[PDB]
Design a protein around this ligand. Structure first.
Ligand SMILES: [Ca+2]
Ligand SMILES: [Cl-]
Ligand SMILES: [Cl-]
Ligand SMILES: [Cl-]
Ligand SMILES: [Cl-]
Ligand SMILES: [Cl-]
Ligand SMILES: [Cl-]
Ligand SMILES: [K+]
Ligand SMILES: [K+]
Lengths: 269, 282, 282, 269
C-alpha cells in the first residue's frame, strides 16, 4: 500500500539468465554510445571505413575490453580523449559487474521447507500448537533459532483496537545443529495467550501465526533467514503430523520428505 | 545545551592519507567517481612525465609532447596496448612494468571500494520528531515511533530505548548514566510500515515520578537504537536518534498515520507521521 | 547403529550445474585450480571452433588450423591483443565482442570464488576421541575436551553440549529429543590451548541416574558445537563432533596433556590429548 | 609454547608498504620465471635480441599484464603455450591480489583505548573494581559489549589445582551506542568472587583480569574486537580515575583523553 528508478536493485534478485542479459545489454549499449561519439568526431579511427558504425563499434569494444589489436587506432586528441574515458569505464564496469556477482553469490536462500499447515493436538498431556521445518540441503545449519509469533487484534483500556504480538513459548527454540526435520511446538498451558481459544475465537481476533527462522548455513558460511505465515484456516485441530523418519529395507534410517505435509486426522461416523 | 544530537551522534568536543579511505566509503557516487577519475588522470599525468624525464622513449610519439606520453601511459596502464606508441629504452620498459602493476592494483582497490560501498546501505528508517507521554493500558507511557521508508521489509528488528541523565553518587560524584528502558515490545518480526515503541512508566521505571521539570534539571536525553535485517539488501542495518526533554509532549498522542485516496484505497501518509494530538484547555 | 557420525553430520538416508558451485567452494586448491584451468582451456577450445565454423576470419592464421584459432581466442579472451592474429569478418568481430565479455565475466567469477574460499577457514579445533564421566567437585561429571590446533587464538568461544535420545511421550509416541546440558562453563575468552568442558550430573541433569545400560537403550548420543572468533582469519569459525554411548569411559579421567622437553621447557603433547586414565581392579 | 610454510598468512597482517613489496616481488619473480621459460625454448619471441633476458622479461610482462603491444610476439607452439599459461596466471594473480586487498580492508582494528590500570574504590557505597575504555575514532560503535573476567587458581574437592574463570557482574555491560568513554565497573558485593580479597590474596591465587570488548563499528560496517589483561600489580587500591569530561572556555563540553590514564590517590603523612 502507498506511502507519501536507478536505485532499482532488481540486479541482485533477478535470475542469472536475466542478469547476464542485462549486463550484456548494458555492455552493447555503452559500446554503441562510444561508437557514436567517435563518429561525432569524423574519421578519428585509423583503418575504419569512414562513417561506419560497425568499425567504430568494434573499435570501441577493443578499447573498452582493452584488447587493443592495433589495426584500428585513434588519431584525434579527440579520439585519444574518448579512449581515455572508455578505459576508465571498462575498468569501473568490470569492477561493478564483479561487485554485483560476488554479492548475488552471498545472498543465498535458506533452503527451508515449512509444513503447509499447523496442528493443535496433545503432546506430553497438553494440547500443543505445532508446525515443522525441513532442511532441503545436505549442508547443515548451525545455531538455528525459530520464533513462533501470534498476531491478533486486541482492545486496550483506553478502548483502542490494535495488533498485539506474542512470542510463543516453545519446548525448544534454539537448535544448535539443524540437519533434517524439526517439529516446533508450543504447549498451550495456562500461560499461553491461546489458552482457552478455539477456532472461532481465533477467527474473531483475526489471529495469524508467524514462524521466523535464522541460522548460519554451512553451505554459504553466512546467516540465512526464512519465514512463513499461517492463518486460522491452516490450523488442523486434532491433527498429528505423519512421521517422516522411517526404517528402510536394510534397517537404515531414512528421512522421507514426501510425508512432510501429511497430517493424520480422526474421522467420526 | 545538547549532549546527543538528534541523529544520535555526540555533541562533545574531542581533545587528545588514512582519512581519504573512510572517505571514499562515505561520499556520494558522483563525488566518489570524480575522485576516482581524478586519481586516474593524475596518475597517468605522473607516468607521462616520468617518460618525458627519460627523453624520447616512446616510439612514434611527438618529442617533448605531454599529450602523446599521456596517451601512451593510459594505453599502458589500462593495458590496451594498441602498438603505435611503444616503449624503447629499458628505462621506458621498466616504467611500463611498474605502470602495469599500478593499474592492476588500481583496479583491485577500486573494485574493493565499490563493493564496500554496496555493502553499507542506509536503514531508511524514519524517527518521529518528538516523543509523547500518555496513557496506554491505564499507564502513563513514553512513546516514539519509527517508519520504514522503503517497500522492502526489515525483519528480525529490535529497538533499544535508553535514558541518559546526570546523577550524583553517594560519594558526591556527578556522572552521566545510561538506563535501558523496558519496552512493552522491543522486537518486530516484520517491520514494514510504522511502529509505536512504548515504555510504560511503572514503579520500575527510572522516570517514575519524574516531571518535565525534574528531567530538565538532570539533563535527561533519550537515545534510541534500531537494528534489523534489511531484505532489500540481504544484510543488517541499524539506525539511531536522540531526543532532549524539550521533545517530549506530555499529554500528546500520535495521530493515525493513514489516509484515504480518491478511489477508496488506504495509503500511509508519512505526512501525518510526526503529527501529535493534544487537548487544549478552555 | 549411529545416528550422528563423529564429525557431527547425519547418518540418515535422504529421500525426497548448481552442484559445481558449492563444489568449487569446497574442493582443495590443486583441484580448484585444475578445474579452473580446465574450464579455461575448454572455453578457448569452443571459441576457436566457433572461428573455424566461420572459415578463415583470422588474418595471418594458417587456414583450418585449430592451433592458430585457439591462440587467437586466448589472446582475445585474455585481451592481450598482440596484433598478428586479428578478426576479419563481422562474424569474427562479433565473436571477439562476446569473447571479451566472457573473459571479463570469467575473471569476476573466478575472483569471487577465490575470495569466498579465503573466507571459510576451518576452525582447527580437535575433539577428544572420547568423553569420560567422573568426579568434579564431588559430583559425577560428563567431560570431553577440545584443543586449538593453531598458534593463533580463538576468542569469544563458546560450546554447547547436547544429549539426543529416544523418548516415549504420554501419548505413546516415540521421538528423538535434544537436551542442552548445562556446563560448569560454556565460554572461553581466549581459547589457545586445551579446554575440558564439563557437565555436572546433578538432580537437574537429564542423565541423572542414567547408566551405560540405560543410555544404550535410549540410543543416547552427545553432540557438541563449538564456535568462536578466529584471530588468525579475523572471522568466525565453528566446529562440531558427536559421540555415542560407547565413547564414554565411565570412571576415566583425561590425562595431563603437557610434556617436558630436554632443555626443561614445557610443550603441549597433543599425543596425550586423547589419553584416558582408568583404575584397574585386582 | 610448543605443540606436537605457504599457509603463512602474514599477507593479511603485515603493513601496507610491506604487503605492496611482497606483491611486487612476487610479480617480478614470476615474470623472471616466464622469461627463462621462453629462453629455454630458444628465440621463440619475434623481435627480441637472441638470448636476452631483458626482452624475454618485458615480453612476459606485456603478456601477463595483457598489454600486448605486438612488437614482441610468440612464434613457437611452445611460446603460444606459455603465453596461454601466463594469461591464466595474470588472471589468477589479479584475482588473488584483489582478494587479499579486499580482505585486508575488512579486518579493521577496534581503535579502543584501555586504561593502563584498574582501581578499586567506593561507588554508590560499595568498593568497586573499575577500568575504562575510550573510542579513539569519531565513528561510533553500536551494540558494544564488554566482559570483565577474573582468572585465578583454585582447588577442587578432589584436590586438583586449576584456573577458574569468573565473568564478573557489571553495573552496565552492554552499551547500545559507544562514542566516547565508558567506565566499566564491578561492584564487589557479597556475591563477588573477589569479595573479601586483598592485594595479597589476589597475588597468591595468581589472579588476573581480562577485559573483552565487542561491537559493530560504523567506521567499517563490521564487528570489531579488542581485549586487555590486567595483573594484580595493576590494580590501584583506593584509586579514582580523573574526570575526562570537562567544560571549555565557552561552556562547550569536551573530552580530554590526555587525562585518561590518570588516577587520583590519597597520600598519608
Ligand atoms: Ca589488455
Ligand atoms: Cl505493541
Ligand atoms: Cl532511504
Ligand atoms: Cl519484545
Ligand atoms: Cl588446521
Ligand atoms: Cl559460562
Ligand atoms: Cl572450568
Ligand atoms: K597490439
Ligand atoms: K593489446
Amino acid at each position: 500500500i502507498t506511502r507519501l528508478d536507478d536505485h532499482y536493485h532488481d540486479l541482485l534478485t533477478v535470475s542469472w539468465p536475466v542478469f547476464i542479459t542485462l549486463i550484456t545489454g548494458l555492455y552493447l549499449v555503452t559500446n554503441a554510445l562510444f561508437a557514436l561519439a567517435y563518429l561525432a568526431c569524423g574519421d578519428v579511427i585509423e583503418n575504419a571505413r569512414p562513417g561506419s558504425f560497425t568499425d567504430a563499434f568494434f573499435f570501441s569494444v577493443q578499447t573498452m575490453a582493452t584488447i587493443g589489436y592495433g589495426k584500428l587506432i585513434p588519431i584525434g586528441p579527440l579520439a585519444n580523449t574518448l579512449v581515455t574515458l572508455e578505459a576508465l569505464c571498462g575498468m569501473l564496469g568490470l569492477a561493478v559487474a564483479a561487485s554485483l556477482i560476488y554479492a548475488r553469490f552471498t545472498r543465498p536462500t535458506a533452503g527451508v521447507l515449512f509444513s503447509s499447515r499447523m496442528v493443535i493436538s496433545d503432546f506430553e498431556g497438553k494440547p500443543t500448537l505445532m508446525m515443522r521445518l525441513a532442511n532441503l540441503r545436505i549442508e547443515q545449519i548451525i545455531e538455528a533459532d525459530v520464533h513462533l509469533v501470534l498476531v491478533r487484534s486486541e482492545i486496550s483500556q483506553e478502548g483502542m483496537v490494535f495488533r498485539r504480538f506474542h512470542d510463543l513459548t516453545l519446548t525448544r527454540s534454539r537448535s544448535p545443529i539443524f540437519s533434517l526435520s524439526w517439529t516446533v511446538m508450543h504447549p498451550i498451558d495456562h500461560h499461553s495467550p491461546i489458552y482457552g481459544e478455539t477456532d472461532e475465537t481465533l477467527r474473531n481476533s483475526h489471529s495469524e501465526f508467524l514462524v521466523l527462522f535464522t541460522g548460519h548455513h554451512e553451505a554459504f558460511a553466512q546467516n540465512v533467514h526464512a519465514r512463513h505465515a499461517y492463518s486460522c484456516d491452516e490450523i488442523i485441530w486434532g491433527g498429528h503430523f505423519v512421521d517422516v523418519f522411517t526404517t528402510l529395507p536394510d534397517g537404515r534410517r531414512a528421512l522421507d520428505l514426501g510425508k512432510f505435509h501429511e497430517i493424520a486426522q480422526h474421522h467420526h461416523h
